[PDB]
Design goal:
The chain has 499 residues and is mainly beta. The protein is built from five helices and 31 strands. It has three domains: 133 residues, Immunoglobulin-like; 180 residues, Cupredoxins -  blue copper proteins (Immunoglobulin-like, Sandwich); 186 residues, Immunoglobulin-like. The strands form seven sheets. A six-stranded mixed sheet has the order 10-9-12-17-14-15, with no helix packed on it. A five-stranded mixed sheet has the order 11-19-18-13-16, with no helix packed on it. Strands 20-24-29-26-27 form a five-stranded mixed sheet, with no helix packed on it. A hairpin with a 2-residue loop joins strand 21 and strand 22. The structure holds a molecule of 2 linked components (NAG-NAG) (2 copies), copper (II) ion (4 copies) and sodium ion. Keywords: Copper, Disulfide bond, Glycoprotein, Lignin degradation, Metal-binding, Oxidoreductase, Repeat, Secreted, Signal.
Length: 499
């Protein structure tokens, strides 16, 4: 069952064996992935998070981010540790109480403390639209049509060297999959369809690092949503999905009744499908209960290309149709050396006092804010352009902005910008050497918004900056509850920190 929009959510430690190998984890709702949190557009969500963690090897503090939800007027509920809150300590709880006006689509939730989400705190978050403009394109859209893609590690995250190339041990599809080494024939996930029906498959990358080449043997996929943004219909036979991205696609169950492989090939870790790694099963009702015998093609003739995507609504692009044609045009210098990432020459290291609390306490320019050099102020009611030229080691890096979605004016592997009708999204691959992926948005949401690579090992190694949007209006726009004001005193007392 789905939970929400008003629900408790307990965060616990438990052993799990999703690939046949047992290890302890950090779990929401006792499962991997966590339960789906759901509601309708415009609903009030009140997710009371109970921190019941006791195993220090995965951190006993926590904080949860609601990925892709704008949090307008509720910046304090966004979740990134030391940007919008201090962590929740063990034995305490915290009500994330916010609203989702003007958004409907496929989202997710995850720990936003250190690399803790890698240790298991990740699940889907779906905001349905009772008047969805895409409703007539499918018959079925429910918890059974959500498909999660996850990387899974046998080593605990707090034992992963910072700045290292860290490689997973299994791909998990809907929580199940097989290990790349010492492979055992552990259970594969089954997605069941009825011949003749059409399904809204909600594809969610809950990855900490790899991108996946996702396909379904014998089937094609008609994209209708990108990171929460409704798209024109685009039919593809393969989707390369980067960490934290989401797509909805229509699956037409129009092939012969049978079993078909579902494939998710990561860019690192095990290559191919030997022993049923990187795999799940699409089973038609009435098919024999047996593994598929289907083949992938040698090459995919209609792969997703990001410039082929266009919004269903007339979203356009803010600003003027040339590079630098914005009120506040920025170019970030994105670099890596010696185990640490940097943005504009500064490697992100979380501050002692969360950025939001620094601003509420009266610090009101970005040079007064800590970490020094890690906070850029944005002016209110302005068009912002951010160029993100690639080249830093460990690519392709999927950059994500909190508090906003954005027009993708230039995409990976294509030097031509689009000022007319590009897709809008919230997480974007910045591509490869010489690319100049560029995003635009308007500043109508006061508060400090994190910008970072969504490969969680890279964030940990410093690949982040904070956009302090409309510092002067942050306090009036974001009144804070007493329980939020209580978090830093409690956290600092528990950890013997003075501030
Ligand atoms: C990416 O595009 C940005 C503009 O959006 C380019 O920025 C210019 O950089 C040159 C020096 O390299 C400066 O003289 C200009 O002031 C910048 N802004 C402009 C022209 O609008 C940036 O060079 C591009 N990067 C790559 C690698 O192509
Ligand atoms: C590279 O990106 C550009 C810009 O998004 C793509 O150019 C568009 O191509 C479409 C489809 O043919 C045309 O309707 C638009 O007028 C083009 N816009 C511009 C600004 O040129 C281009 O197709 C992409 N290249 C590849 C190989 O997909
Ligand atoms: Cu996220
Ligand atoms: Cu986010
Ligand atoms: Cu990265
Ligand atoms: Cu973040
Ligand atoms: Na425009």
């Amino acid at each position: 069952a789905q939970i929400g929009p008003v629900t408790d959510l307990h965060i616990t430690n438990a052993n799990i064996s999703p690939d046949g190998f047992s290890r302890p984890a950090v779990l929401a709702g006792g499962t991997f992935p966590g339960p789906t949190i759901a509601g309708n557009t415009g609903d009030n969500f009140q997710i009371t998070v109970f921190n019941d963690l006791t195993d220090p090897s995965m951190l006993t503090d926590t904080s949860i981010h609601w990925h892709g939800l704008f949090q307008k007027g509720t910046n304090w509920a966004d979740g990134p540790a030391f940007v919008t809150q201090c962590p929740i300590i063990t034995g305490q709880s915290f009500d994330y109480n916010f609203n989702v006006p003007g958004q409907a689509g496929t989202f997710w939730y995850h720990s936003h403390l250190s690399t803790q989400y890698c240790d298991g705190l990740r699940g889907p978050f779906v905001v349905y639209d009772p008047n969805d403009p895409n409703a007539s394109l499918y018959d079925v859209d429910d918890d059974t049509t959500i498909i999660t893609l996850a990387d899974w590690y046998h080593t605990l995250a707090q034992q992963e060297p910072i700045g290292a190339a860290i490689t997973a041990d299994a791909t998990l599809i809907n929580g199940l999959g097989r290990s790349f080494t010492n492979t055992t024939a552990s259970p594969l996930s089954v997605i069941t369809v009825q011949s003749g029906k059409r399904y809204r498959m909600r594809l969610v990358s809950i990855s900490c690092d790899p991108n996946y080449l996702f396909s379904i043997d014998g089937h094609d996929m008609t994209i209708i949503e990108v990171d929460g943004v409704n798209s024109q219909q685009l039919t593809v036979d393969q989707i390369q999905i980067f960490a934290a991205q989401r797509y909805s696609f229509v699956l037409n169950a129009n092939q012969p009744v049978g079993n078909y492989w579902i494939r998710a090939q990561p860019n690192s870790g095990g290559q191919g499908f030997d022993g049923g790694i990187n795999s799940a099963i699409l089973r038609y009702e009435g098919a024999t209960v047996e593994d598929p015998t289907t083949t992938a093609p040698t090459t995919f003739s209609n792969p997703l290309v990001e410039t082929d995507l266009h919004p269903l609504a007339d979203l356009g692009v803010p600003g003027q149709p040339f590079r630098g044609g914005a009120d506040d045009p920025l170019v970030l210098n994105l670099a890596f050396a010696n185990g640490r990432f940097s943005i504009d020459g500064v490697s992100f290291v979380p501050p002692t006092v969360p950025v939001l609390l620094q601003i509420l306490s009266g610090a009101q320019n970005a040079q007064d804010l800590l970490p020094a050099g890690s906070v850029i102020s944005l002016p209110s009611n302005s068009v912002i352009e951010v160029a993100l030229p690639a080249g830093a080691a460990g690519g392709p890096h999927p950059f994500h902005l909190h508090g906003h979605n954005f027009a993708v004016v230039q995409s990976a592997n294509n030097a031509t910008p689009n000022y007319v009708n590009p897709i809008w999204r919230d997480t974007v691959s910045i591509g490869g050497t010489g690319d100049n992926v560029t995003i635009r948005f308007t500043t109508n949401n006061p508060g400090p918004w994190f910008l970072h690579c969504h490969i969680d090992w890279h964030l940990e190694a410093g690949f982040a900056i904070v956009f302090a949007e409309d510092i002067p209006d942050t306090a009036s726009a974001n009144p804070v509850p007493q329980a939020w004001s209580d978090l830093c005193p409690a956290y600092d007392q528990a950890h013997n920190i003075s501030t």
